[PDB]
């Protein structure tokens, strides 16, 4: 005696909030009743006014003040004047079709509207009905607001394990969940939660991905056109870190790029591509600087006859942590063993001058030590040394002379290799 109706009801997924044309199908449905009957009736509890019994006004979930108006259509369906609620079909065919459709050209905001409606059969001149709830979703690019923040002050060289390199924060008041994948020529896990990135200048690769604690905040893993996506509750934060063991990172800028899409869960989940956002930020791995080094050219040098030991440049090696540093000139022709005097060629003329530490600036050196088989004159840091025209008076052609130093920190009879090379130009002027 208990034989009951069978509805199928397929809703749309890709609805973009905004303007919708009247007649736009939102759902398609079929009812199937095999017993004795003379028609079908589908109706709602969300109905509008007793005289338009086909029309429905729907209040949104995110905020009940959002409104969409729909109507029960179908070929052969006419309004149920008898009840005042719903639409009726007349046929003894066991199977009939019907559509739900926006009524009136409207502007629909971004929300989800529950459309719970009811279906039953009519006997030959109540029996057993079916009830279904189902959500229409309208989505917009602004549904979830995303922010990807690069971490400040990373240093090159070997980094800490799982070093935090970005922060993804996703917020939303419309959508309940979101999925995220990296975008890279080289992803290394099925879910796109770990990939590799090339530095813009070097081309060297680092391995990045989601932190071990961000991965555990995922509600589920979904397929979307064959690709695995991890899903997360919106209004949460995921951390992008340096995956795997501790990396040795070349000093460079690395671009990480994320694919973020809204997800509407359902025990039948769907992704909302209208809500999708891709964002890219640059992560800077700067090189670590034990020795702050400032080399500054003297200003107002003029071509022609110059003074013996005339000051050309001033170098100041300031270190907050290390006391003694060594120094050498870099050139194709150094004139003494210690590397403290050498010769520099003009860019435009290519004629050279003799530059070097001033005699006064020498013998402020603590010692002279051996590193790499070459000798370095050590000094005390936070002292300032001056570069000068070495030896006799010099007649310098007006040109720009690139001076280049090589400084290393030393004290302890060893030299730590955060040596730096800095190079300024010196201008002579007719």
Ranges of CATH 2.60.40.1570 domains, the chain: 6-137, 144-286, 292-427
DSSP string of 117-140?
Answer: EEEEEE-----S-EEE--EEE-B-
Resolution, expressed in angstroms to one decimal = 2.8
Residue 2 CA from chain centroid, whole number: 57
**Are β-strands 270-286 and 154-155 bridged in parallel, bridged antiparallel, or unpaired?**
parallel
Residue 393 is given by DSSP the state -
Identify the experimental approach: X-ray
Range 6-137 has CATH code 3.30.230.10:
no
In this structure, the dihedral spanned by the alpha carbons of residues 210, 215, 220 and 221, taken in order and rounded to 10 degrees, is: 40
Nearest to 415 by CA among 364, 361, 375: 375
Residue 255 CA from chain centroid, whole number: 8
Nearest to 273 by CA among 264, 282, 286: 264
Dihedral sign, Cα of residue 181, residue 185, residue 190, residue 195: negative
User: Who contacts 281 (Cβ-Cβ below 8 Å, separation ≥6)?
Assistant: 148, 149, 150, 166, 255, 256
Hey, what CATH topology would domain 292-427 get? Immunoglobulin-like (2.60.40)
Burial class (CB in 10 A: 0-12, 13-18, 19+), 344: buried
Residue 372 CA from chain centroid, whole number: 44
DSSP string of 209-271?
Answer: EE-HHHHTTEEEEEEETTEEEEEEESSEEEEEEE-SS--EE-SEEEEEEEEEEEEE-----EE
Q: Which homologous superfamily does the CATH classification assign to the domain defined by 144-286?
A: Dr adhesin (2.60.40.1570)
| β-bridge partners, 49 | 52
């Amino acid at each position: 005696m208990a034989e009951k109706l069978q509805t199928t009801l397929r809703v749309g997924t890709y609805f973009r909030a905004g303007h919708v044309p009247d007649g736009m199908v939102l759902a398609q449905g079929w009812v199937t009743y095999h017993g004795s009957h003379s028609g079908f009736r589908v109706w709602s509890d969300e109905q509008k006014a007793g005289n338009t019994p086909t029309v429905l006004l729907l209040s949104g979930q995110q905020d009940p003040r959002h409104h969409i108006q729909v109507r029960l259509e179908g070929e052969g369906w006419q309004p149920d004047t008898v009840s005042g609620r719903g639409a009726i079909l007349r046929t003894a065919a066991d199977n009939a079709s019907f559509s739900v459709v926006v009524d009136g050209n409207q502007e629909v905001p971004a929300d989800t509207w529950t459309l719970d409606f009811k279906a039953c059969a009519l006997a030959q001149e109540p029996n057993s009905e079916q009830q279904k709830s189902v959500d229409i979703v309208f989505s917009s690019p602004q549904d979830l607001t995303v922010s990807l923040i690069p971490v400040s002050g990373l240093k090159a060289g070997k980094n800490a394990p799982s070093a935090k390199i970005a922060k993804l924060v996703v917020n939303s008041t419309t959508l309940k969940e979101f999925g995220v994948r990296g975008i890279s020529n080289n992803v290394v896990d099925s879910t796109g939660t770990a990939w590799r990135v090339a530095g813009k200048n070097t081309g060297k690769e680092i391995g990045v991905g989601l932190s071990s604690d961000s991965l555990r905040r995922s509600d589920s893993t979904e397929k979307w056109n064959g690709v695995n996506w991890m899903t997360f509750n919106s209004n949460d934060t995921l951390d992008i870190v340096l995956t795997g063991p501790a990396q040795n990172v070349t000093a460079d800028t690395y671009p990480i790029t994320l694919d973020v899409v809204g997800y509407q869960p359902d025990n039948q989940g769907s992704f909302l591509p209208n809500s999708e956002q891709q964002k890219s930020v640059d992560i800077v791995f700067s090189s670590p600087q034990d020795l702050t080094v400032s080399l500054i050219p003297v200003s107002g040098l003029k071509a022609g006859k110059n003074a013996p030991s005339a000051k050309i440049a001033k170098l100041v090696v300031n270190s907050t942590t290390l006391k003694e540093f060594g120094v050498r000139g870099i050139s194709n022709n150094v004139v003494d063993s210690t590397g403290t005097a050498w010769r520099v060629a003009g860019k435009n003329t290519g004629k050279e001058i003799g530059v070097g530490l001033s005699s006064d600036s020498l013998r402020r050196s603590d010692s002279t030590e051996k590193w790499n088989g070459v000798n370095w004159m050590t000094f005390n840091s936070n002292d300032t040394l001056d570069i000068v025209l070495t030896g006799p008076a010099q007649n310098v052609t007006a040109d720009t002379y690139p001076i280049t130093l090589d400084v290393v920190g030393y004290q302890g009879s060893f030299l730590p290799n955060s040596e730096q090379q800095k190079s300024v130009d010196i201008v002579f002027s007719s």
